[PDB]
């Protein structure tokens, strides 16, 4: 209840508008109306003549016209007139998506397929299905500015992408993957909003002034009328769930979400999802168990969260990188720690932050976390979106892949990664306001030294996927994923991990594994048969003893 | 460890100074030295020639000289040179102060005694002791600007009041009350700092920029180097405890304390206190159980918190007042609710805040809360610090007193209140900077319509206590307090509360009680003997039946 709503032959036009004294519905084709200012601030109007797939605009005191910020669809553009649409209505009380079987596929509809749409992504389903992926993570689709954005400048939480195809598309996309047995997962932004076409700012107080994130400010979940803003949101989830049978959510930068209420909006949100037996994941910097933790342990109960710690230990290890966050890691130990104690910063000094970061994860299954060697952030923010293939030797890159998929964690692949893809994932934007299409420039430029003019179509297309398969890489993966399942590796953290100067043997429940970064002697303490190797130099049948190995990775049993 | 520290014949000069490249110790009489910039930001120097009750100043890059912000003493003034002092050193691992026996006496050293010092307050001990008070709550003494402040512009957390007597004084004051069996309780500010003479602002980043309270900003417990700032503080408590055998603390406006860390600085602090088997109370707006709640229930474990809800229900009821917060209450029901469900806003709509305030207190004893009909805030913020005596009829004022002391809660009296005192408690300030001595004016003026120029000595003295005893009132109290003890009323919330249109009978474990705001029939459901009455019209021996009563209060058995 926030945009519109169809009764019978009736449409209702709710409108959070505290700051307005008089607002007017304005079916573009029909006419202009007068809202029902209620004490809370909700102008309102009831219709029946409309059914029409009509474009409308709210016209406020000021003299300006605008679009339903809970717009179900912004066809014409961000300044486009909101529009009417059917009520998707059907969905099911459940996601086939059990967790343990989680393989995530981060996909950016845009640059993915050359089409760059749902359709685009539909074609690849079976490819995906094949790969072994258990679920698809769709980058943000909340109506953004222009046509070329990662999707982080979304400004219409309720409105589905113009470009990407929109509603039906998204609709189909899911219905489809559903059929193919593919789980879809939406990545939503609740910690901020796009710098273009955001009108909230006039209707009332959607955002809190008490605080300031980095991308401006978060919403108002606290002061003034938090009730309303915090309802926006919670409903906003229920929608996706109901009007799109979505299978789960991924929350951008939760730590930019400030709530002091006795009930943190997270836990607030989690609830909504778990109510529909859906799933939630969150991007979270704070090395805080709180998030993922259960209620009984004072946790918001989010299902699982990303663990950038895992990455870095690996990445900066393989690459000789030590910039920005990289400085907190880049060492063998880090990798193992992360391996047996989820966080590398369990409550310790980050010179990076000059603070005393995070704290002990408990005894939570590896399935509360989601590891990865790549994602838009990790690639995207480089200034030259270097894919990881471009900074490590092939043996290495093969090893990595192992690590992350052979973890108890919840492996998720960046798109392209599995087939050995090499184009960069740049930072691109499609903003109309001069001042942004400028700020943005010295931004990335100063922030990430990105020479590519994000506003340049080039930068965009340059990031598109070159579907140039590399069966070497491509095959590997396919197995790994398959081995993992076969293997029963998921969630389970009952693991022994050894390491030598440049090596790392890791027992599991049913298997072992070798990671050798450099020719070296190893006192292998176990007997099993080869399951897979990076190289050929690996002994189909192994036995406990001292052997010399070569830069590579092998898998026992 | 933050100011100084004496080894043997040695003094150490620690100094959090991230932003400085070079700082210099400067014994005023001796010389100027060079600090030991450490990687963290701590300039430092070690001395032995000093022992001297020497005044010193840190001289920074900039070219300015300043005083140890962890100054143990600012004799000369706020811009006064910090100074050396002995190590109080002794204290005991315990406070005789059990809770259940808590009667608080909020005292403002300044305007109290005509002396207006510790001494001043020392003279009254036995008076106090008599009254029945179990402990003394000292308004803020953290070195403020000037001589006339409630003490909320403190700026030297470590430094004891010039005016009020200082160190020895404070020292004695406690040693004294200790002897007289009186418990002393300090009221500390950790959610902000005085607008005058605050240097922190240059030494490094003591305050967080991410947020903004109302009185500017809180400290940095989160970002950058929170470690250091959050250490300042935690030590700051331990000091009071060790260098002053203090018995407990009262925390101003905790809800202005923002911490996102896995361990809220509160809980952080609580720990420190409970470590010394001391006691903590906090002023807290958020109707959140969290505070007071126990660890096992995800609470910071503060010992108890104020419950302004209680007040208002009563006050606005007795007075016909409905301004500012008053609007959320002023009705019989409110009073009872508050009476059996601590908070009146257990999670409900405050038009006052236009939000959905607070939440259910659990099943915590009445001793987690502290009720009261008066305090500096409640009186102070009126623009004309009207004492409550001046707005309700005498019968009423007698009734009130009953209510609050006959509660399971933790009654605390404002100074003056017990003997029927009528001078106002105004808002007064003693600032030197023109711009404040101006801001402050239209402030109070606009905020509270306070005509009194807070900066006017008048306003100050006018607030001093006129020790004009009124044995009518004075006696009453004395009993009440005595009855309470006798009675076994404390902490226990196993209470039945009835009310009629204008009356309120309240059983307890061992007693009942009548509150009649207006001539009315009452179906008294019990038999007991008169224990005390506001009036004389009360039946020494009572029995269950319908009787007509007169505006007053009576106590059975």
UniProtKB/Swiss-Prot annotation, chains A, B:
Annotated site residue numbers, Transition state stabilizer: 377
Active site as annotated: 252 (nucleophile), 283 (proton donor)
UniProt pathway annotation: Glycan biosynthesis; trehalose biosynthesis
SMART domains tied to this protein: Aamy
InterPro entries reported for this sequence: Glyco_hydro_13_cat_dom, Glyco_hydro_b, Glycoside_hydrolase_SF, Ig-like_fold, Ig_E-set, Maltooligo_trehalose_arc_C, Trehalose_TreZ, Trehalose_TreZ_E-set_sf
GO molecular function, one term: 4-alpha-D-(1->4)-alpha-D-glucanotrehalose trehalohydrolase activity
Catalytic activity field: hydrolysis of (1->4)-alpha-D-glucosidic linkage in 4-alpha-D-[(1->4)-alpha-D-glucanosyl]n trehalose to yield trehalose and (1->4)-alpha-D-glucan
GO cellular component: cytoplasm
Broad EC category: hydrolase
Localization in the cell: Cytoplasm
EC number of this enzyme: 3.2.1.141
Key words of the record: Carbohydrate metabolism, Cytoplasm, Glycosidase, Hydrolase
Result of changing residue 298 to V: Reduces activity by 50%. No change in substrate specificity
Gene Ontology biological process terms from the UniProt entry: trehalose biosynthetic process
Binding positions (substrate): 250-255, 308-312, 376-381
Subunit structure, interactors included: Homodimer.
Family that this chain belongs to: Belongs to the glycosyl hydrolase 13 family.
Protein name (Swiss-Prot/TrEMBL): Malto-oligosyltrehalose trehalohydrolase
Species: Saccharolobus solfataricus
Gene giving rise to this polypeptide: treZ
């Amino acid at each position: 209840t926030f945009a519109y709503k169809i009764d019978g032959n009736e449409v209702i036009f709710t409108l959070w508008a505290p700051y307005q004294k008089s607002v007017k519905l304005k079916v573009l084709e029909k006419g202009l109306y007068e809202m029902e200012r209620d004490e809370k601030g909700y102008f309102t109007i009831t219709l029946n003549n409309v059914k029409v797939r009509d474009r409308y605009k709210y016209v406020l005191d000021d003299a300006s016209e605008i679009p339903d910020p809970a717009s179900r669809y912004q066809p014409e553009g961000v300044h486009g007139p909101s529009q009417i649409i059917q009520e998707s209505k059907e969905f099911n009380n459940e996601t086939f998506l059990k967790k343990e079987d989680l393989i995530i596929y981060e996909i950016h509809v845009g640059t993915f397929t050359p089409e760059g749409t749902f359709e685009g992504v539909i074609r690849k389903l079976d490819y995906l299905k094949d790969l072994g992926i258990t679920a698809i993570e769709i980058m943000p689709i909340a109506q953004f500015p222009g046509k070329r954005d990662w999707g982080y400048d979304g400004v219409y939480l309720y409105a589905v992408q113009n470009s990407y195809g929109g509603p039906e598309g998204f609709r189909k996309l899911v219905d489809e993957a559903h059929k193919k047995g593919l789980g879809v997962i939406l990545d939503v932004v609740y910690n901020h909003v796009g710098p273009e076409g955001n009108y909230m700012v006039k209707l009332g107080p959607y955002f809190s002034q008490k605080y300031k994130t980095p991308w401006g400010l978060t919403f108002n979940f606290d002061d003034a009328e938090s009730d309303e803003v915090r309802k926006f949101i919670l409903e906003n989830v229920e929608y996706w769930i109901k009007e799109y049978n979505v299978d789960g959510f991924r929350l951008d930068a939760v730590h930019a979400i400030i709530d002091t209420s006795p009930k943190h909006i997270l836990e607030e949100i989690a609830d909504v999802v778990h109510k529909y037996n859906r799933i939630v994941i969150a991007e979270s910097d704070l090395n805080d168990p709180r998030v993922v933790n259960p209620k009984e342990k004072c946790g918001y109960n989010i299902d699982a969260q990303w663990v950038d710690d895992f990455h870095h230990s690996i990445h900066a290890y393989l690459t000789g990188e030590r910039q920005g966050y990289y400085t907190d890691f880049g060492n063998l130990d880090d990798i193992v720690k992360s391996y047996k104690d989820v966080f590398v910063y369990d409550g310790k000094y980050s010179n990076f932050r000059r603070k005393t970061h995070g704290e002990p994860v408990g005894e939570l299954d590896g399935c509360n976390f989601v590891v990865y060697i790549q994602n838009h952030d990790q690639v995207g923010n480089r200034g030259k979106g270097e894919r990881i293939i471009k900074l490590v030797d092939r043996e290495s890159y093969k090893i990595a892949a192992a690590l992350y998929l052979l973890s108890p964690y919840i492996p998720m692949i960046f798109m392209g990664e599995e087939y050995g893809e090499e184009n960069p994932f740049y930072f691109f934007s499609d903003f109309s306001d001069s001042k942004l299409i400028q700020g943005v420039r010295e931004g990335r430029k100063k922030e990430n030294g990105q020479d590519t003019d994000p506003q340049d179509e080039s930068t965009f297309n340059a990031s598109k996927l070159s579907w140039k398969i590399d069966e070497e890489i491509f095959s590997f993966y396919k197995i790994l994923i398959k081995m993992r399942k076969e293997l029963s590796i998921a969630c389970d953290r009952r693991v022994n991990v050894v390491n030598g100067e440049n090596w790392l043997i890791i027992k599991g429940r049913e298997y072992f594994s070798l990671y050798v970064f450099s020719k070296s002697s190893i006192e292998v303490k176990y007997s099993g048969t080869l399951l897979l190797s990076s190289n050929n130099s690996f002994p189909q049948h192994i036995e406990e003893g001292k052997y010399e190995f070569d830069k590579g990775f092998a898998l026992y049993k």
